[PDB]
Design a protein around this ligand. Structure first.
Ligand code: QUS
Lengths: 256, 58, 64
């Protein structure tokens, strides 16, 4: 009956409300995806329960145990009925789960502490270290690129010691902030743009996006919800709600 | 034409109509994914991102 | 659409230009009739091409 929604504590998509300990259920959270979940649920006619993914990961298949972790795993093993999060539509995921059309368009980008202007720049040097989220579509983009500059970047990143990979986006952001310009972070343009509008306003997005892709609402392969969820995403985009929500969470409340 | 539904006859024209009435098996073109179309035909994930814009003479 | 606009902007007589930002954000998709045997495979093929970098390659080829 009640749809279990798996999501991730990733700002500004889902965050704990300042007074969450005094609130119950869905009311404990706020964010772009919290606002989107309420709307998808109204338009699809279902009751839901927001739950934060237990391992705090997006979703990758372990080469070895072949088990899917993160939000993708929760859907694959039936622990959740739908994922409403900044989950990237990728070929490997689409093979095991269904995705609505994109609710947000984006691409990999470079985040620097306020002398690097591009991925080519990062590749040609070694003083400034750089990495990605330890588990996610960004790390996979590099591990599989056949493009020279990106393959060179991957060769470096995968062998860098200490590790240049981070467990969460917040961790990558803090590393950039505390490294005196000696660490650049590769992350999705959406997260980059958000952080650029957050105090202490010491980071910046540089260069163009490395690729073009989108985030989609995910459901277990063959779910009853897929069709309606997809139609809802298309309707909300055409009406302008998605743009409204991005403005609300990225720029209207910007601190810089 | 790309494809729109006649308000009167409810008949689809353009590439959309060709798919709807079985004249073509697939449309590979700059065909925009929309709610009205998604109701009558299937669309793959996007191969290109875009938005409406304004073209002016310099 | 921004796509046609920016293409024309880079073609003689070079007398037009795109002004302002896009009014919305959407995408183009390969379409098939409802229940088509091709639907599933074409969708996965689009995802493969984007990830291989082929779509960006074709875009630069025909625009830039
Ligand atoms: N949305 C990404 C997670 N992730 O966020 C980034 O900024 N990079 C990255 O891999 C995914 O779905 O795997």
């Amino acid at each position: 009956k009640t749809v279990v929604v798996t999501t991730i504590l990733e700002s500004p998509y889902v965050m704990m409300k300042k007074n969450h300990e005094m609130l119950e259920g869905n009311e404990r959270y706020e964010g772009y995806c919290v606002d989107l979940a309420a709307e998808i649920a109204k338009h699809c006619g279902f009751k839901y329960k927001l739950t934060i993914v237990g391992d705090g990961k997006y979703g990758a298949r372990d080469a070895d145990t072949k088990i899917w972790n993160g939000m993708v795993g929760e859907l694959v093993y039936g622990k959740a009925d739908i994922a409403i999060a900044p989950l990237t539509i990728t070929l490997v995921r689409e093979e095991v789960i269904d995705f609505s059309k994109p609710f947000m368009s984006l691409g990999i980008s470079i985040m620097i502490k306020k002398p690097i202007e591009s991925a080519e720049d990062l590749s040609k040097q070694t003083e400034i270290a750089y990495g990605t989220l330890d588990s996610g579509s960004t790390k996979e983009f590099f591990r599989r690129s056949k493009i020279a500059v990106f393959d060179k970047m991957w060769t470096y990143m995968r062998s860098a010691e200490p590790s240049v990979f981070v467990r969460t986006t917040a961790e990558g952001v803090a590393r950039v902030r505390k490294s005196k310009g000696k660490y650049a972070y590769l992350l999705e343009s959406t997260m980059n743009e958000y952080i650029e509008q957050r105090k202490p306003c010491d980071t910046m997005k540089v260069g163009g996006n490395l690729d073009s892709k989108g985030y989609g609402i995910a459901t277990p392969k063959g779910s009853s919800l897929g069709n309606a969820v997809n139609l809802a995403v298309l309707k909300l985009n055409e009406q302008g709600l998605l743009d409204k929500l991005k403005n609300k969470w990225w720029y209207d409340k910007g601190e810089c």
